[PDB]
Design an enzyme around this catalytic site. Structure first.
Site, PDB file in Angstrom:
ATOM      1  CG  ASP A  15      -4.804  -7.098   3.084  1.00 57.09           C
ATOM      2  OD1 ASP A  15      -5.322  -6.331   3.958  1.00 57.09           O
ATOM      3  OD2 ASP A  15      -3.456  -7.581   3.445  1.00 57.09           O
ATOM      4  NE  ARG A  29      -5.873  -8.826   6.364  1.00 52.45           N
ATOM      5  CZ  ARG A  29      -5.086  -9.425   5.777  1.00 52.45           C
ATOM      6  NH1 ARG A  29      -5.538 -10.291   4.702  1.00 52.45           N
ATOM      7  NH2 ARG A  29      -3.794  -9.480   5.879  1.00 52.45           N
ATOM      8  CG  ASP A  34      -0.100 -11.399   4.824  1.00 52.13           C
ATOM      9  OD1 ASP A  34       0.722 -12.232   5.362  1.00 52.13           O
ATOM     10  OD2 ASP A  34      -1.219 -11.173   5.301  1.00 52.13           O
ATOM     11  CB  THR A  35      -2.427  -6.992  -0.397  1.00 52.36           C
ATOM     12  OG1 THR A  35      -2.978  -6.455   0.750  1.00 52.36           O
ATOM     13  CG2 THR A  35      -3.138  -8.029  -0.973  1.00 52.36           C
ATOM     14  CD  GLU A  37      -1.339  -2.300   5.202  1.00 51.80           C
ATOM     15  OE1 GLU A  37      -2.222  -1.650   5.039  1.00 51.80           O
ATOM     16  OE2 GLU A  37      -1.359  -3.211   5.791  1.00 51.80           O
ATOM     17  NE  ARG A  75      -9.307  -6.094   9.614  1.00 48.41           N
ATOM     18  CZ  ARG A  75      -8.224  -6.271   9.482  1.00 48.41           C
ATOM     19  NH1 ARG A  75      -7.567  -7.343  10.352  1.00 48.41           N
ATOM     20  NH2 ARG A  75      -7.434  -5.995   8.456  1.00 48.41           N
TER      21      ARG A  75
END
EC number: 3.1.31.1
Length: 131
Positions: A15, A29, A34-35, A37, A75
């Site tokens: 992400d 971002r 939501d990916t 990690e 970000r």
């Protein structure tokens, strides 16, 4: 909303990505996703997905939403497009990310993402394979 030019500096992970935006090197971002990690289940897949998608794209575009454009870490918060295809949506559609909680009014493509997610879930793709 409107798409703006950006240039790939370096792929990071599922992400986040390093891009040049208006002459400044920035970390972006991906909005509403939501990916996992990298060193987490489906993380290598999510990272490889975005890497391939962005590294082979001729045109990278950033589309800020109607809310806050940068988070506390500095970000950039945007929908990223690779040759007209939304990276945010592509990830969710593949079951390599879940739709995230809305951050400061950035919800324009929330329904679209939720639809990409629902289809991935219905197909039991990756993160949804244990439903």
């Amino acid at each position: 909303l409107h798409k703006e030019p950006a240039t790939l500096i370096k792929a990071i992970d599922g992400d986040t990505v390093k891009l040049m935006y208006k002459g400044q090197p920035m970390t972006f971002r991906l909005l509403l996703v939501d990916t996992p990690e990298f060193n987490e289940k489906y993380g290598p897949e999510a990272s490889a997905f975005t890497k391939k998608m962005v590294e082979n794209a001729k045109k990278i575009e950033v589309e800020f939403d109607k809310g806050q454009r940068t988070d506390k870490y500095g970000r950039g918060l945007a929908y990223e497009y690779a040759d007209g295809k939304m990276v945010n949506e592509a990830l969710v559609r593949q079951g390599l990310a879940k739709v995230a909680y809305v951050y400061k009014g950035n919800n324009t493509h929330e329904q679209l993402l939720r639809k990409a997610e629902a289809q991935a879930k219905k197909e039991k793709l990756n993160i949804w394979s244990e439903d």
